[PDB]
Structure formats: structure tokens, C-alpha cells
């Protein structure tokens, strides 16, 4: 095999050769450093407010954004079964409230299809972005 890595193409050797030449840029121009920081991902969003308070804020935000929702019974109060406009045109979502700890709650958002194996979550991702922002503005 005569397949190799060209030594002069490595940044260390290229910089060193430029330095030896006398070029000012060799000392002054630094390599690009990209801080690839590891993101902590979560499902949905967290709130320290209590259930009725949190649910109220979501419904408020939902109303201002133009969503409609089903009437919840006593057995599913912490579940929002909503529909949103954005050919099936109405997007369905299920929002669910969970308790993490005593004072800590997690809001769960779930894409639930469209109304009149292979699908794009992007319309859902965009609308949830709108919703999350509306929730931030109101706080």
C-alpha cells in the first residue's frame, strides 16, 4: 500500500512550516475551537407551580394561540385532548401533566395525528415551539 496521510497537511506541521517561513499569521491566527458541549435533553417542560395553576396557564396559552380542546371528565383532568389548525388540516395533540417530585411537575406533549410508519413531526415541533414561548411570555 502507498496510501498515506500527507504530513504537510496536518495543522501542526503546516503551522510549524509557516512559522519557520517567518509569516506573522503563524503566531497570530489560532485554530478554530468548537466547544461541542453535551446538551441535556428532557421530555416536555418542567414547572414548579402547582397542578391547577400549571393547567390553567397551558389552557390560557392554548386559547390565545387558537387551539380547541375536548371537555375532560373527572377521571382525566390532567390530560388535554386538543386540536389545532396550522387534505386533513387539524393537528391533534395530547398534553399530559405529571408529578416528578413534591414541588416539581413535568408537562408532556404528544403528537396524536391529523383530522379533517411514515410521518413528519415538524409541524408538531413548530407549534409546540409557539406554545412553549407563549408559556414563557405569560410568566
Amino acid at each position: 500500500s502507498t496510501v498515506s496521510i500527507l504530513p504537510t497537511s496536518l495543522p501542526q506541521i503546516h503551522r510549524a512550516n509557516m512559522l519557520a517561513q517567518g509569516s506573522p499569521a503563524a503566531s497570530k491566527i489560532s485554530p478554530l475551537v468548537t466547544k461541542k458541549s453535551k446538551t441535556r435533553w428532557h421530555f416536555g417542560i418542567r414547572s414548579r407551580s402547582y397542578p391547577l395553576d400549571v393547567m390553567g396557564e397551558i389552557y390560557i396559552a392554548l386559547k390565545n394561540l387558537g387551539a380547541e380542546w375536548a371537555k375532560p371528565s373527572e377521571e382525566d383532568l390532567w390530560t388535554i385532548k386538543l386540536r389545532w389548525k396550522y387534505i386533513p388540516d387539524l393537528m391533534k395533540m395530547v398534553i399530559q401533566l405529571f408529578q416528578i417530585e413534591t414541588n416539581n411537575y413535568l408537562v408532556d406533549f404528544k403528537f396524536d395525528g391529523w383530522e379533517s410508519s411514515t410521518f413528519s413531526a415538524y409541524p408538531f415541533l413548530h407549534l409546540t415551539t409557539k406554545l412553549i414561548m407563549e408559556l414563557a411570555v405569560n410568566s
Binding site: 502507498t2 496510501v3 500527507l6 504537510t8 497537511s9 491566527i29 410508519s117 411514515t118
Partner: protein, 311 residues
């Protein structure tokens, strides 16, 4: 001996072609993987950070206003905006304000795209990439409820060649020297020297429509290469003065984790080439002579074309 090497090369290629004809683009997809998409209203500068932060050179764009995908952000988009900004230095204060949809407008105004269904044969995906003269192709399907076309993934020539290499031991029987195959591009090489202004090298990329420009010295010895990808690090810092540097100086911006330029000779074999593609992200092999003078380049498209269509 010669006849043996030849028929074995022929058996290996026919086997690789059958493989490509028998697999689909869907098959190349990992069982679980991530797809990064950018909203068209995102700033170009931020989008560049997203690429560099996530170790990718490309991303599909999403127009939220119309619920439609809007093509791909690639290094070419950044190449085109550099030339625009250089020829119009007054606009530099607008870099900070330029959004991806704006960037696409600028390119359209300056007068400066292939897709495939996952179910189609991998062979056909390769043909379409050769026809479009690009190293990547979006995988497109229809949303089963909305019937909006959606991007499932983006496949590259690299990923396909690596897929072939990982699954086909037959590559080891590709023992004919590449110089005997007439697959090296040797004629009308676009090249430069370390003292060439980087803007001129960037022009060569667009004018020649190549991904890289080999840097030689006065005697024709290969020293380094400037790649389309290098333009991303050039923008990240300070567009203003970096565009005025020589290629030698602009290269100082290369990250220390740059993997290096790969070279080979005419006596090298596709078996070796495929082993290298298998073990590392290599996008081209510069062909040098016995003393390290540039004689040509062998790119992923050159290798794929040979596998699909022969010499």
C-alpha cells in the same frame, strides 16, 4: 496472473453491482439515527454554529410558514455568500442579520435538486448522485396522513461506499492498480500555491465546481489542500480580514482535529482504497508520483462511477 487479477476484479465488481441493485436506500439507514433540520428564519451565523456543534456539513431546511421543506443548507451556500460579501464589503454589517431564507434569496438573485425514495434500489440512488454531480442526496417520502413530502435522511456517496465496504468482502479482490482503470482525473487539474489569495481559491471551487483545490509548490509537489469545508471555519471567526488572507494563512484556522489529506499512487488498488473508506472518513485520494508530485485526484464519485458503469 494478469488474467487472474482481471477476472477476480470482474467477479468482485459484478458482485458489488448485484449488492447495490438488491439493497435500497432505506437499508443504508441506521436502525436509530438523528436528523437535524433548521427553520428557514434562523440566522446564517447561528445555523453555521449548529452545523459545527453537531459535527455535520449539511441540514435540510424547514419553512414553518408553508409547512414545507426548502432544500438543503450545504457548504456551497456558504461558498456563495462569501463571494457576495467579498465583492460587496459594504454589506458586512448585514451578516449578523442574514437569515437562511434571505441567504437562499441572495443565491437565487445571483443565479447561483436531486432526491430519492428510500424503497428505490441503492444503485439508482448512486446514479442520481452522479447525474446531479453532488456527493449527497435527500431521502424523500410522503407523510401518510398529510401527503406532504418529507426528508427522512440525507445520504452521501461516502455512506454508500462505506456501506458497500462493510457488507462486501469482495472489495478485497479489487486488485487492479487504479492507473490501469482510467478512473483518475488527471487532466485540467485546478491547483494553487500557498501564496494564492484564499478568495481566489474559493473562486476556483465555484468556477471549477470542485470540493477541493490541491496546493502545490513551484516544483509541483503536493503540500496541502483547501476544501469547501474549510470555508466554514473561515466564516465562523471574523469574515472581514480572513477573506483577504493567502491560502497558507487562512489554513491556520483549521482545527487541530483535521484528519489530513489522503494520497495514493497509480499502483494502489481499489481494495486498499475501500479499506481506507471503511476505516476512516476519506472523501478523496490525491494521486501523486514516486516523489510526491501531484498527478491527479480520485474522488468518491470517480470510485462510484467505476463500480456502477466501469471504465
Amino acid at each position: 496472473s494478469q488474467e487472474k487479477v482481471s477476472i477476480e476484479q470482474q467477479l468482485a465488481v459484478e458482485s458489488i453491482r448485484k449488492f447495490l441493485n438488491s439493497k435500497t436506500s432505506y437499508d443504508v439507514l441506521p436502525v436509530s439515527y438523528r436528523l437535524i433540520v433548521l427553520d428557514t428564519s434562523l440566522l446564517v451565523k447561528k445555523s453555521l454554529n449548529v452545523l459545527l456543534q453537531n459535527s455535520i456539513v449539511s441540514a435540510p431546511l424547514w419553512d414553518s410558514k408553508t409547512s414545507r421543506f426548502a432544500g438543503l443548507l450545504t457548504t456551497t451556500d456558504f461558498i456563495n455568500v462569501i463571494q457576495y460579501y467579498f465583492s460587496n464589503p459594504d454589506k458586512f454589517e448585514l451578516v449578523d442579520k442574514l437569515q437562511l431564507d434571505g441567504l437562499k434569496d441572495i443565491e437565487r438573485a445571483l443565479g447561483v435538486t436531486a432526491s430519492i425514495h428510500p424503497s428505490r434500489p441503492l444503485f439508482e440512488a448512486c446514479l442520481k448522485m452522479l447525474e446531479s454531480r453532488s456527493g449527497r442526496i435527500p431521502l424523500i417520502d410522503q407523510d401518510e396522513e398529510t401527503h406532504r413530502e418529507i426528508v427522512v435522511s440525507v445520504l452521501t456517496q461516502y455512506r454508500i461506499l462505506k456501506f458497500v465496504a462493510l457488507n462486501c468482502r469482495e472489495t478485497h479482490f479489487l486488485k487492479i492498480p487504479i492507473g490501469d482503470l482510467n478512473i483518475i482525473t488527471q487532466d485540467n487539474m485546478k491547483s494553487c500555491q500557498m501564496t494564492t489569495p484564499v478568495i481566489d481559491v474559493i473562486q476556483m471551487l465555484t468556477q471549477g465546481r470542485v470540493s477541493s483545490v490541491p496546493i502545490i509548490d513551484e516544483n509541483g509537489y503536493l503540500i496541502n489542500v483547501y476544501e469547501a469545508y474549510d470555508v466554514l471555519g473561515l466564516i465562523k471567526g471574523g469574515i472581514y480580514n480572513d477573506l483577504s488572507l493567502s491560502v497558507g494563512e487562512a489554513l491556520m484556522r483549521r482545527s487541530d482535529d483535521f484528519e489530513g489529506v489522503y494520497t495514493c499512487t497509480k499502483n494502489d488498488k481499489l481494495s486498499t482504497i475501500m479499506d481506507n473508506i471503511r476505516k476512516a472518513r476519506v472523501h478523496r485520494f490525491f494521486v501523486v508520483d514516486d516523489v510526491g508530485r501531484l498527478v491527479g485526484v480520485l474522488t468518491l464519485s470517480d470510485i462510484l462511477k467505476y463500480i456502477l458503469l466501469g471504465s
